[PDB]
Design a protein around this nucleic acid. Structure first.
Ligand SMILES: [Zn+2]
Ligand SMILES: [Zn+2]
Ligand SMILES: [Zn+2]
Ligand SMILES: [Zn+2]
Ligand SMILES: [Zn+2]
Ligand SMILES: [Zn+2]
Ligand SMILES: [Zn+2]
Ligand SMILES: [Zn+2]
Lengths: 107, 93, 81, 98, 105, 101, 94, 106, 82, 98, 100, 100
DNA sequence: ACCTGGAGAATCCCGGTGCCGAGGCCGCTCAATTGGTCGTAGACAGCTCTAGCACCGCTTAAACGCACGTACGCGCTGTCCCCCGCGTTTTAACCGCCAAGGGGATTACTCCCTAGTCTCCAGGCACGTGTCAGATATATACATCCTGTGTAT
DNA sequence: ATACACAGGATGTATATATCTGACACGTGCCTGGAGATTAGGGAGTAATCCCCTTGGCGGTTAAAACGCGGGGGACAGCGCGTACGTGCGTTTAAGCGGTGCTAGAGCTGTCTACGACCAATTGAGCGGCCTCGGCACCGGGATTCTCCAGGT
C-alpha cells in the first residue's frame, strides 16, 4: 500500500507527475500519453546536468566554490552546440568573452 | 501563496555531478528560466507535430521527433538515448 | 517636467560600452547616432510593456511585463522570472 | 619630461578591463528618468517596479554592446581603425533594422 | 464663373460650435479633421480628452500634440465674410493700445 | 509650448453671425488660388487631406503621385507612407458644392 | 473526392467590392489564401498567450483587440481596431 | 428563417467557420461570442487593403488580372505592409528595380 | 546509383544571372566556388528538416507541405504552395 | 571594324533586363539532380513530388539574390565596384549565419 | 620492471569475434568503438547496418563512412604477439608469387 | 577508398594459440603506444577522438579543450566538445590486466 | 636598421578581518497516488488508382573555349586636422534614513454566460463547359552609344 | 596645340496589328456543417479588507563628468603600373519537349480493443520561516610585468 513515486520508478530526479499535470493543463492537445512526461523529464535533466557540469569546471578554474552567472556565460559561449541552442538569449550579469582583433594589436 | 519552481531538483542534479560546489540565488533563477524555456519549446513543437498529422495525443514519439528537430548535433543523439533509456526502465517496473 | 533626459547618456558611458565591444578609436559624431538608436529601441520595448500592463487592469509595470515585451521582439531574457 | 603613454595603449588597457568585468556601465538614475519620460507618452501617472527598470537597463546594454561589435567589424573591412556613423548604418541595414 | 449666393447657406460651414461665432485662427484636430477656434479648443482640451462633437480621443495622454493650424480655411473665411479681418485688427489694436508691456509677442 | 493663448485671445469675444439678408458678391478669381488642386489643375473632387501638413488633393491625384514617384508630399516634400496617412474632408466638398455647384 | 476548404470565394467577393472589373489567377489566389491563414494563426496564438498569462480560461473580444494592438504596426492597427469595434457593435445590436 | 451571423455583422468572411476553428485549435478552454466577429472583421480589412493596392498595380500595366508580380509590387512599395511581411517570400514575384548611384555612367 | 559531382551543374553564367538580379556589375573570378559552398549548406539544412517531417509521418515521398514546414521552422515563410 | 560597346554597358543592360522579370534563372534538371544527391545522405530510396522541388528551387534563388544584394553593399562600402569572397563572408557574419 | 604475462589471459582482448582469430588491419566503428578486421567489417556491412555486438546503428544509409582504420591497435597486436607479422608478410608474398 | 584488393578477398584466418604458453614482455616495449601525449603518464579513464582515433586521459583532454584551442593536440583537427569523444573501456581493461 | 638598461606606472598575489547570504531544520496542508469504471482514438488489414520514375529521338539554344585590350585593383607618397592622453575644476549620483499611502493581492457571494445535446436545411464545394485575356510572331519606328573630325580657345 | 561640341552610323529597344489557345469564370446537384431552442453549472464581475511597497524629502560624502591643451598618427587625395576582367567570335555539349509504359505507394474504409479521462479517498512530498556559521568581499602591502625613451652600433 506504500506510495511509490514515478520519478523513482524511472530513475530520475526531476518530477514526472508535475510535468504530466503541466502538459495536461497547458492547451497542447486533448490527450497526453503515459510515457511522454517521462521522456520530457529525462531530456530536461540531461540538459541541466550538461550545463551545470560545464559551469562547475569553469568555477573550479577560477578558484571559487559557488556558481555565479559569469561561469554560466563562459560555459555556454565556449561551446558551439550550446551557443547555437541559445543564440537569441541574454543572461543577466554575464558579460562577454575577451576578444581583440588581430589588426588592432601593436607592432 | 504556494509557489513552485525546479530549485530542489536542480540542486539534487548538481550534487550528483559536483559533490562539493555551491550555487547562488541569481544563478538558480537563471537555471530555472532555462529549464522552463526548454520545456515550452519542446511542448510547442510536439503540439504542432500532432496537429499536422491530425492526431489528438502527444506521446513519446512526438517528443523524440521534436527533440530531433530542435537540438543541434550531438546534443540530439545524447538526449534521445537518455529519454529512451528512461522510458525503457519505467515500463519494466 | 521630464524633458531632455537623453543627454544623461553621457559620452564616457558610450565610450565604456564601446570598449566592452572592442572598439579602439572613436569618431566625434558617434554619440548622437548612438542616442538615436537607443531611444528608438526603448520606445519600441516600452510600448509593448505598457500594453501588457494596461490589459491586466493595473497601474504598475512589473518585471513580467518587460520580460514578455522582450520575448515578443525576439530577445529572450533569463533571470528575472 | 613627465611620462606620457603613446596613443592606443590606454585604449587597449580599457578594452582588457571592461571585457573581463560584468557590472552595469550606464548610471542608474539618469536611465530611470529616461524610462519614465519615454513612458509618459502612453499612460499618465505610471508606477514602475524596481526590477522592471533593472531588466530594461540590462537588455539595453546588451543591445548596444552587440551593435558596437558589428560596427567594429564593418569599419575594419574598409581598412580603417576608426568607427564612423556610416559603419553603424551599414550594420543596422544588413541586420534588417534599417 | 458668375454667381451670387446668400449668407444663410454659407453660415453653417463658417461658425465654431463651441463659441458660435465665425472661425478665428482656425485650428483642426487631425484625428477626425475637425475645425474649431484656437482659444476654444485650447480651453476645451484641458478638462476633456475627447472631441467636442464625435468624442474621438485626440491623443492617448497629451491631446495638444495632435492639433494643427488651418491657414487655408482662415483665408477663405476672411475673404468671404465682409468686414471681418478689419474688425479683428481693430479689436487687437484696441486691446493692446493700453498695455505698455511686452511690445514684441 | 507653442500653444499659450495671447493676452487678447484670453478675452476675445465671439463674432455675431450676420442675420440681415444682404447679398454676397463672389468672383471666381478670388477663390481660384485656395480651391485648386496643384496636381490636376482643376476643381477639387473627393478631397483628401494629409495628417501632417493639411494640404488638400484629389484622391486619384495623390494615389498616382505616391504610386510612381517619391513617397513625399508634392507641395512641401514632407514624407508620407501611403494613402492611410490621408483622410477625407467632406466640409470642403460641401463648400464646393454650395459656392460652385 | 474529399472536401477541401479555403477562403477563395470570400476573397473574390471582396475584390469585386473594391475593383468591380478585375480578375485574379490561380497562383495569386493561392498567395492570398496563405496570407489570410498566416494572419489568423498569429492573432490566435497571441490571444492564447494573453489569456494564459492572466490566469483566465476564456478568449473574448478584449484579447483579440489587445493582440491586434500588439501585432500590426502604425495606422493599420488603428483602422483594424475601428473596423472590429464597428462590427461587434453592429452584431450585438440584432 | 435562419440568418447567418456574417450578415448580422455586415461582413463577408465566415463567422461560424472561424468560431469553429477557434474552438478546435487548442487556444483556451472557452471562446466568447464576440471573438470570431472581431477577428473576421480584421481579416477582411487586411485582405481588402492588399487587394486594392494590387489592383492599382495591375491597372498601371494595362492588365485586367492580378498576378504574383503585382502583389509583390504592391506589398514591397508599402512601408507598413512591408514591415508586416518582412520575413515572407512570394513565389514568382521578382524584385524591385534598383541600381546604386555609383554604378551608373557619368 | 551514387550520384556525384552534381554541384558543378550550377554553372558560371547562372550565378552571373543571379548576381544580375541582385544588382551586381563586376564579378571576381574566385567567387563561383563560394556560392556553391553556401548553396550546399543551405540546401542540406532545409532538406534534412523536410526528411525528418516525412519520416515522422511514416511516408516514403517528400511533399511540398514538408518543405514548407521545414522552411517555416527556419524563419523563411513561403507563400504559394499551400 | 565592329561596333564594340565599352566595358560595363552590357552589364547595366543585363541588370535592367533581369530586374524586370520573374523567371527562374537556374536550369531545372541540374538543380533536381543536386537535390536528389544531397537527399541521398539522409534516407534511402526517397521519392519527391514535383512541387516540392519547385518550392526548394524558389526558396534557394530568393536566398541567393538577397545575399548578393547585401554583398554588393559591402563591396561598395570599401570604395570598390567588384565583389569578392570577403564581402560574402562579412555579409554572412553580420547576418548571423556564421 | 619485468613481467611474465600469459597470452591465455589476453586472448579475449585480442580476438576478432567475426573470423575467430586475431585482428588483421584493424578497423573500428566510430559510434561504439568495436574493432574488427577490414575484410570482416567490409563484407559484413554490405547486408546489415548494425554493429554485431552492441546492436547500434552506424549510419542512416551509408555505414561505410563511420569506420576508421586503427593503426595503433594493429601495431600493438603486431608487437605483443611474437612471430605474427613476419608470418603475415611471408604468406602475402607467397600468395603473390603463385599468381601473375 | 575501402575497395578490397584481389588478395584481400581470400585472406586465410589466423589460428589462435589454444595451448597455454608464456610470453616475456618488458615495460619499455609498449612505452610508446600506451603513453599520454600531454601528462606523459599511464592512461586512466581513456577517451578517444571520433575523427582521428587519438587516445587521451579524460581530464587531460577536458582541460585542453576548456583552456585552449578547440583542435586535437596531435593532428590539429576540428573538435567541438567532450561530446565529440568517446570512452574506451577495452583499452583500459587491457592496460589494467597487462600492468598491475 | 637593430640593440640594451633603466625608470616609471600598472596588474597580480597575500594575508587578515567581518558580515551576510546560502545551506539546513520543522510543522503542515494541498497535490500526487492508488483503485475503479467507461467510451473512443488509434492500430491494422485490405482495396483503389493516381503520380512518380524510366526510356527514346530530335532540335537548338545555352554552355564552353579562345583572344584582345582596357580600366579598375593595389601600392606608394605627401599632407593636415582630428582625436587621444592627461591635468584641473564642477556637477550630482549613491547612500542613510523617516513618513505616508496608493493599489496589489486575497476573500465571499451571486448570476449570467458558455458548453453540450438534438433537429434540420441552406452555404459551400467538386464537376463540367466555353469564350476571350494574354502570349506569340512580324515589322517598322524610335532612342542610345560610340567614334571621327572640325576647330575654337 | 589641345579640348570639345557635333554629326553620321549602327546597334538595341519600343510599338501596332494579327491570331491562337487554354485557363478564368460561371453554372449545377448534393451533402455536411452552421443555426435554433433547451438545460445546468461554474467562471468572472463586484464589493470589502489589509498591509506591502512604491513614491517623496533631505543631508552628506566623493567618484565621475566636464573643460582645455598639445602633438602624433591616422584618414584622405593623387599618381602609376599591370593584370585580370569584359566583350565578341566560332564550336560543342546537353537541356528541353513530346510521347511512352510501368507500378509503388498515398489515400480511403471498416472492425475492434487497449489506453487515457474522470471521480473519490488518503497521506507524504514540497513550501514558508528561522536560525546560523563559513565563503567571500574589502584593505593594505610587496612582488612582478610591461611600456618608453636615451644612447649605442
Ligand atoms: Zn470657437
Ligand atoms: Zn471629432
Ligand atoms: Zn487633382
Ligand atoms: Zn504638404
Ligand atoms: Zn576478423
Ligand atoms: Zn558496437
Ligand atoms: Zn594524460
Ligand atoms: Zn587527432
Amino acid at each position: 500500500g506504500k506510495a511509490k513515486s514515478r520519478s523513482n520508478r524511472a530513475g530520475l530526479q526531476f518530477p514526472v507527475g508535475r510535468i504530466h499535470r503541466l502538459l495536461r493543463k497547458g492547451n497542447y492537445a486533448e490527450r497526453v500519453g503515459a510515457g511522454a512526461p517521462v521522456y520530457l523529464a529525462a531530456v530536461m535533466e540531461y540538459l541541466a546536468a550538461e550545463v551545470l557540469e560545464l559551469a562547475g569546471n569553469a568555477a573550479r578554474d577560477n578558484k571559487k566554490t559557488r556558481i555565479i552567472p559569469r561561469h554560466l556565460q563562459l560555459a555556454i559561449r565556449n561551446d558551439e552546440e550550446l551557443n547555437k541552442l541559445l543564440s537569441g538569449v541574454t543572461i543577466a550579469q554575464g558579460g562577454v568573452l575577451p576578444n581583440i582583433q588581430a589588426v588592432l594589436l601593436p607592432k | 501563496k504556494r509557489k513552485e519552481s525546479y530549485a530542489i531538483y536542480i540542486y539534487k542534479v548538481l550534487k550528483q555531478v559536483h559533490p562539493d560546489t555551491g550555487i547562488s540565488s541569481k544563478a538558480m533563477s537563471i537555471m530555472n528560466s532555462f529549464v522552463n524555456d526548454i520545456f515550452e519549446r519542446i511542448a510547442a513543437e510536439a503540439s504542432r507535430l500532432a496537429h499536422y498529422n491530425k492526431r489528438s495525443t502527444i506521446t513519446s514519439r512526438e517528443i523524440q521527433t521534436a527533440v530531433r528537430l530542435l537540438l543541434p548535433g550531438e546534443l540530439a543523439k545524447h538526449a534521445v538515448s537518455e529519454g529512451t533509456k528512461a522510458v525503457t526502465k519505467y515500463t519494466s517496473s | 517636467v521630464l524633458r531632455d533626459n537623453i543627454q544623461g547618456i553621457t559620452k564616457p558611458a558610450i565610450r565604456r560600452l564601446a570598449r566592452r565591444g572592442g572598439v579602439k578609436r572613436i569618431s566625434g559624431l558617434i554619440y548622437e547616432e548612438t542616442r538615436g538608436v537607443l531611444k528608438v529601441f526603448l520606445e519600441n520595448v516600452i510600448r509593448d510593456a505598457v500594453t501588457y500592463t494596461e490589459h491586466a487592469k493595473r497601474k504598475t509595470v512589473t518585471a513580467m511585463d518587460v520580460v514578455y515585451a522582450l520575448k515578443r521582439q525576439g530577445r529572450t531574457l533569463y533571470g528575472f522570472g | 619630461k613627465p611620462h606620457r603613454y603613446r596613443p592606443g595603449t590606454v585604449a587597449l588597457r580599457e578594452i582588457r578591463r571592461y571585457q573581463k568585468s560584468t557590472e552595469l556601465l550606464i548610471r542608474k538614475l539618469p536611465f530611470q528618468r529616461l524610462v519614465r519620460e519615454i513612458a509618459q507618452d502612453f499612460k499618465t501617472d505610471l508606477r514602475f517596479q524596481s526590477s522592471a527598470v533593472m531588466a530594461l537597463q540590462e537588455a539595453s546594454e546588451a543591445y548596444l554592446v552587440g551593435l558596437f561589435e558589428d560596427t567594429n567589424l564593418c569599419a575594419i573591412h574598409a581598412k580603417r581603425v576608426t568607427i564612423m556613423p556610416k559603419d553603424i548604418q551599414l550594420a543596422r541595414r544588413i541586420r534588417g533594422e534599417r | 464663373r458668375t454667381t451670387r449666393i446668400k449668407i444663410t447657406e454659407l453660415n453653417p460651414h463658417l461658425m465654431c460650435v463651441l463659441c458660435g461665432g465665425y472661425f478665428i485662427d482656425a485650428t483642426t484636430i487631425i484625428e477626425c479633421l475637425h475645425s474649431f477656434c484656437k482659444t476654444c479648443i485650447v480651453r476645451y482640451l484641458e478638462t476633456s480628452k475627447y472631441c467636442p462633437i464625435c468624442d474621438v480621443q485626440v491623443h492617448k495622454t497629451r491631446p495638444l500634440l495632435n492639433i494643427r493650424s488651418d491657414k487655408t480655411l482662415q483665408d477663405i473665411v476672411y475673404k468671404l465674410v465682409p468686414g471681418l479681418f478689419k474688425n479683428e485688427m481693430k479689436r487687437r489694436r484696441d486691446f493692446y493700445a493700453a498695455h505698455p508691456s511686452a511690445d514684441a509677442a | 509650448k507653442t500653444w499659450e493663448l495671447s493676452l487678447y485671445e484670453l478675452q476675445r469675444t465671439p463674432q455675431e453671425a450676420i442675420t440681415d439678408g444682404l447679398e454676397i458678391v463672389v468672383s471666381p478669381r478670388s477663390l481660384h488660388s485656395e480651391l485648386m488642386c496643384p496636381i490636376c489643375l482643376d476643381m477639387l473632387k473627393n478631397t483628401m487631406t494629409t495628417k501632417e501638413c493639411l494640404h488638400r488633393f484629389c484622391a486619384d491625384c495623390i494615389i498616382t503621385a505616391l504610386r510612381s514617384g517619391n513617397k513625399e508630399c508634392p507641395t512641401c516634400r514632407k514624407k508620407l507612407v501611403s494613402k492611410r496617412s490621408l483622410r477625407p474632408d467632406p466640409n470642403f466638398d460641401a463648400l464646393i458644392s454650395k459656392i460652385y455647384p
